[PDB]
Amino acid sequence: KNYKQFSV
């Protein structure tokens, strides 16, 4: 959904 998820 144009979604993005990142670990920081």
| Rounded Cα gap, residues 5 and 8, in angstroms | 10
- Token pair 């998820």 is found at 5
Q: What is the resolution of this structure in A?
A: 1.7
What is the CB neighbour count within 10 angstroms for residue 3? 4
Q: Which two tokens stand for residue 2?
A: 């144009």
